[PDB]
Assembly symmetry: D3
Homo-oligomer: 242 residues x 6
Amino acid sequence: SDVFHLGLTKNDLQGATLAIVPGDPDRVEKIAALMDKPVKLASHREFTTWRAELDGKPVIVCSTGIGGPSTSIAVEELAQLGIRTFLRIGTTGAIQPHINVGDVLVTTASVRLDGASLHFAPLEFPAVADFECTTALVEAAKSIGATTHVGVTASSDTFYPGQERYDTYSGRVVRHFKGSMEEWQAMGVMNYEMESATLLTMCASQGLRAGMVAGVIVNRTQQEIPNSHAVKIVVEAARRLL
Amino acid sequence: SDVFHLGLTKNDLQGATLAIVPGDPDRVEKIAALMDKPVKLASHREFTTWRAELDGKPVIVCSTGIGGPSTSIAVEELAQLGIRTFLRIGTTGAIQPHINVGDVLVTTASVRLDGASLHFAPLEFPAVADFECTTALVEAAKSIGATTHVGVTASSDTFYPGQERYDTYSGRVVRHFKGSMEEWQAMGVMNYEMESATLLTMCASQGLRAGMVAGVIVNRTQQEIPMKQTESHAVKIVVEAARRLL
Amino acid sequence: SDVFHLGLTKNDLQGATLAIVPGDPDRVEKIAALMDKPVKLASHREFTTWRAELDGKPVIVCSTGIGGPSTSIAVEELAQLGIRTFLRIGTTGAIQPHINVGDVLVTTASVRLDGASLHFAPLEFPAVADFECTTALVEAAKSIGATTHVGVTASSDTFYPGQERYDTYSGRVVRHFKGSMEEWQAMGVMNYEMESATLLTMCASQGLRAGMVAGVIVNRTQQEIPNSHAVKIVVEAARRLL
Amino acid sequence: SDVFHLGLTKNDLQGATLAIVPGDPDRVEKIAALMDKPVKLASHREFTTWRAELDGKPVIVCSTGIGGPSTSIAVEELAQLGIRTFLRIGTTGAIQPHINVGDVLVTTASVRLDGASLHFAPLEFPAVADFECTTALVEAAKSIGATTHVGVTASSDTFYPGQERYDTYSGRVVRHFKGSMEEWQAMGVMNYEMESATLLTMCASQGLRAGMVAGVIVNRTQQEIPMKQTESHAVKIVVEAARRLL
Amino acid sequence: SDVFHLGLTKNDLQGATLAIVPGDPDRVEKIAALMDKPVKLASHREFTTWRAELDGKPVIVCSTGIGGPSTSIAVEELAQLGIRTFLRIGTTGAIQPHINVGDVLVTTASVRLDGASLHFAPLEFPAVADFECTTALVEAAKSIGATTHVGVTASSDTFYPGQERYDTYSGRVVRHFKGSMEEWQAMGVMNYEMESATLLTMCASQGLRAGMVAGVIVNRTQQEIPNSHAVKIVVEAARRLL
Amino acid sequence: SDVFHLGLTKNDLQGATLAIVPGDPDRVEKIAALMDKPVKLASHREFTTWRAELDGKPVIVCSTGIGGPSTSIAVEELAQLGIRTFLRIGTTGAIQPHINVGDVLVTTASVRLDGASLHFAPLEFPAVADFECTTALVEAAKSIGATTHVGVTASSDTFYPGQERYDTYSGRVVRHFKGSMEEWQAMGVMNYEMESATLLTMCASQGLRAGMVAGVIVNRTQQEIPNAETMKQTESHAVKIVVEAARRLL
Ligand SMILES: O=c1ccn([C@H]2C[C@H](O)[C@@H](CO)O2)c(=O)[nH]1
Ligand SMILES: O=c1ccn([C@H]2C[C@H](O)[C@@H](CO)O2)c(=O)[nH]1
Ligand SMILES: O=c1ccn([C@H]2C[C@H](O)[C@@H](CO)O2)c(=O)[nH]1
Ligand SMILES: O=c1ccn([C@H]2C[C@H](O)[C@@H](CO)O2)c(=O)[nH]1
Ligand SMILES: O=c1ccn([C@H]2C[C@H](O)[C@@H](CO)O2)c(=O)[nH]1
Ligand SMILES: [K+]
Ligand SMILES: [K+]
Ligand SMILES: [K+]
């Protein structure tokens, strides 16, 4: 193996330069299966890698696990192997009252509520998505007719306090995040998730193209805890970026 | 007058909701003149405002002056009068050796090296341009055939130390900014300018649409201190983008 | 022209080493006219420059525009031309209930709510005025008998949120500045304006002398939006600093 | 299921209040197997959970995945199910030349180079391990005779730049971390790993007991990129400490 | 004299490598007097130094004065003289309702609300006590049967605002610390004092062993202003560390 | 006693509203003895307090010890007992080559390299002296004849690494302060000391008047440790100035 964590070699990728990067290892095979000649390559820790073919070109599907840190490992090591384009596909909680469960959200840029992004660029640097990737994602969503929102995402190193959840062991939120959800809504932020800030920052600051799309599984103006269109979209976007 | 600085009334705008915002008051009339029925509205401090017409729709052209603070006054007060879309047109100096004088830069988001943006959103919030504005700008540029770069801009509160210029009175740069250009360079940042961080942050965090386009007048990989046809390209592009956003 | 923005040459200055720097280009000629042999030198963007003579010495009057960034340009380029002493004359909003519209405020040092000052010295460095300049201004005010307050000024990169104005398009103020006016008042801060923090920091940290005086045009304990003694004072101070 | 990520119920735990939290799901079963009556409970994402028994008391073994964020999910949700003591077992790379591959490191507190800990307590709050857990870990180490170091650990959100690795795609490290390893080295810091800052801070600030132990697999004073008997030592140590904290 | 402030020579120490460091100069002799052959060595500014003998080994008692800054001088200069182990003995205000006046508090690590610690290590570095020292203190306290709490301490550069006291000349507390005591209680912090952050950080980051114990003189859930078990404990702990 | 640390009552002050505040408890009596009717009030920890009379008015002299934190206690407690003007008197080491041993420094404001000032106002607030105090100090200096420098002082919570000293147990300086002395020098900072940032910030933000003067006893840019005797005399010079300044502020 050529990389320390993923257990992959340059050769396993077979010239692939695009990766769809879901968070959950168990959803890797599922995404791969929507393409041609899906093949499992490796599985170590939270990193599960499949290779498939899309319009006759090799494409990687590799899971990041939850969070900036493991994402930063996946992305670095895939880049070493030759990946230049990363499409992230996630689940997310919407924080605006007009976004519905099942809606698709495309992130133009992220509020950096993470630690890992600071390891690539200082805070003033925008966690901005690649324009071609964003365009591909928006356009893909248009063509499958999914209801889509485009805008800014709050990207948090935690699922609980950083997203201002109060149903927790302690029931408290640190001073810094008390009242934070409401500030982000006032600023038009669409949703919370946990990886985009890292992904976008590490890519934007290293010449790698990244885009970001998520399916809404809960609306935070209703509920803290949650009770496929996006997967179709990310694959179709990959198709346009090949 | 309905606003404190611009010396304009809601009426003067005639239902305009889009503004082209150059930095220089003297450049305002030139831009308005590319459109129909250009009329001077007002001129106070660095804020010169003309109204014109584009495919029969009223459009504002308004100068920001240099820097976030004055930009923030013009944007706020325009927003009060009904503007909802802001297209910035500028000059800039590239910091990438592949970008040439004459090229056009469309900013997706900015490195926030300014003070005003912090007055609208904390630092972690992205100084990101509106997707539709960026699209219109990129498409306008394609349509007139300019060689174009799309990416990140470093937006500084100073022309000198914040852009790591050493050829100054003191000849020196504060510790924080020493070696900073080389860092932005490695991170793929295209250029320095002085207003976008404020503009993009204040718009993105208040439901206002903003976009940024600039023509390259100098390249820092050869010179610190700094062609008329280059800003003619950029102006043409911004006006054409306005057309698509109406 | 010897400088990139002001369109002036060393020669235009005629040995001048002192500049009165108002914010508004339209008030430059007005100030120059209080001195002898006033002459327009240049006008570019927000930078309008006149030269005049005071007790037989050449003096510059040059506008900064609104805000640290354009101020930093004017001051840098005037320094390059040989100016060593900067007197700022502005308009301001008082935030103490006992300071009246028409009162003259002399800044000893500023609360740095700007970005540009950080490009000259880190935050811990005081935005302090020069002692000779402050003395001149205080003494000038005494001799024309204007009612004067001497003390600390909050210098803000914005006119709206940074000065906690709520009559705005959005009607909100970012968390950081919510309740900030009241903190500054409790701390004895006299007023808000937008340039001193930049001016004072850039000069104090480069061996340039700077002083700062403003006429109060609104009292913020009453109003957000506003409805010449100071000009006389700045000129008279210049006279003592020659 | 009672918790959103782990896929467990309060019942599955059978009154367990202590959890051993390795990073790697694949290591969970190995650890459980050193105890009595090991049973797989659940496996979702990077979270694999086994239950076992230690001196007749139920004990949880549950993987965190790599990094503070997923760690914080595991710990929060385990806390919701009744766990009050967390023992982390890891692999690490030492940055002191006197610490050898094979040595065991017990962390008293961590340099907080992570994002998640800030979600529980501001930066000035110490990422400090629980005194009893640290004592149990040190005593367990002594009892099996491993050569042990007790001290401060640097806990980074990245494996690469945050640990000042240059042998990467870009070959560069952000200004903030340039020269950082030499600083931690001078300050007596033993090693880099990626979870403890989050773990220790979130437990220390919520009345939960946490401890940290790792086996040294590589030494940075010779190599960036990286024996089976070393982690066998550390695992033996963590289980024995668990025994003493029951 | 070998050091700039303490007026001591290597030789005065007679091979001592452990120092008990109280805050108050007047309490130095008192502590020394609990050991054998107590001898006054020096007295300059807030730094009073006695030497005594404990189980036939020389031991220093040296006062730090109040606050990180003077502490940092004492510790640095003692270290130059050969001290490698520092045991702090202080008075403190408890902020948990269950901790009583007279109780003994052993600090595992401190919330760094001081300035001096940042001069040794950046804020992300833990103000953690040495494990052997903490063990010695805890065990000492067990053996003399004093009622003891072990945990985190908030260490503040001020006695008034940084500990959220309101009975002051001004009666205000700066925004940053408004509501701070309650946050620290929620987080399990036991108490306020003023030196541990500096001591623990400067020691932990230079290979010096440090421990921290204090007797509770006020409970802040009742009172702002206050109306020997700890001294016995620090001495006994020194004994175990020799 | 009316205050927790100083062991003073409002009555002890006899209506005093000005205090001279040196660093060292042992210099308090010496300063007070320059004035009339000097009397010891109290002595607890590093806080020694004498009262004297200047042109018929009662005046306090009170030591702060070293550093923001204790200064903060003394100023607060003095303020509660009715003090409204604080004059800091010290000795210091210059970092500018033109400033000589023997010179006198009046500080207009300080670089805040301390912790305690943040407990009073956020970092952006200037650690600035009161204008009347600074004027009185500069004018006192001019009247007794000192060669005076007026400007910015760097106020540090440590004597060693924060002042960039490498002659230490560890011989190293934290990243933040590495190369910092050269930066302050380039920015015209006159000297380092250890209390002004706290004092000036806590006063300027609470309607208290503060000022500071110091004699130069050493210069970091030259070699040349002067002398025990030249240090004693420079110190007397500066004390003479603060007292004379106190006169003008009464
Ligand atoms: O409300 C929600 C729903 C989903 N996620 C994300 C991204 C992360 O990997 C994982 C946590 O459930 O899914 C959230 O952060 N918040
Ligand atoms: O190198 C350059 C060229 C242009 N500008 C910008 C934006 C600002 O208003 C003005 C200064 O020349 O133009 C720069 O900042 N840097
Ligand atoms: O309340 C007020 C009145 C005036 N100004 C200032 C300085 C700036 O250039 C311009 C904006 O009105 O005037 C303020 O900041 N606040
Ligand atoms: O040099 C090393 C060796 C191991 N780890 C850790 C903790 C993290 O979960 C995972 C990454 O390899 O192992 C490091 O961070 N750095
Ligand atoms: O509530 C209290 C009681 C005592 N001390 C401390 C430590 C410092 O040296 C001195 C100041 O009173 O005593 C406090 O900080 N807070
Ligand atoms: K993970
Ligand atoms: K301007
Ligand atoms: K002290």
